[PDB]
DNA sequence: AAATTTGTTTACTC
DNA sequence: GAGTAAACAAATTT
């Protein structure tokens, strides 16, 4: 099922965040120092960071992907080194 | 080329 | 409204 109770930042048991895909994005770019992240190292955050995203990567994704281009406050912008994600406090 | 991750789109269960 | 599902074009790497 999903969270038993009001742990925090444990990532140690498979147990489902009780967060949306948009929050969680949003968290990842704002702890990179320059507040953008690729969209690879998205995928190394969510894996990092919570065991239930470490089983079945197809699922979540294309949810990843299905939720940045579809919400205004995430833009792609091209760097040196390749196209990253950054988010619009607005 | 051709392979394949990387991004935009409309619509189904719940 | 979100979580999946698929379908398809665009970047980006083989």
Same mark, same amino acid.
């Given at each position: 099922?999903?969270?038993?109770?009001?742990?925090?930042?444990?990532?140690?048991?498979?147990?489902?965040? $009780?967060? !949306?895909?948009?929050?969680? =994005? #949003?968290?990842?770019?704002?702890?990179?120092?320059?507040?953008? &992240?690729?969209?690879? /190292?998205?995928?190394?955050?969510?894996?990092?960071?919570?065991?239930?995203?470490?089983?079945? $990567?197809? !699922?979540?994704?294309?949810? =990843? #992907?299905?939720?940045?281009?579809?919400?205004?406050?995430?833009? &792609?912008?091209?760097? /040196?080194?390749?196209?990253?994600?950054?988010?619009?406090?607005?």
């Amino acid at each position: 099922p999903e969270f038993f109770h009001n742990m925090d930042y444990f990532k140690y048991h498979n147990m489902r965040p $009780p967060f !949306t895909y948009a929050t969680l =994005i #949003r968290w990842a770019i704002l702890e990179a120092p320059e507040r953008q &992240r690729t969209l690879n /190292e998205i995928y190394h955050w969510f894996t990092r960071m919570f065991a239930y995203f470490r089983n079945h $990567p197809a !699922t979540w994704k294309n949810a =990843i #992907r299905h939720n940045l281009s579809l919400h205004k406050c995430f833009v &792609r912008v091209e760097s /040196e080194k390749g196209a990253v994600w950054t988010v619009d406090e607005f």
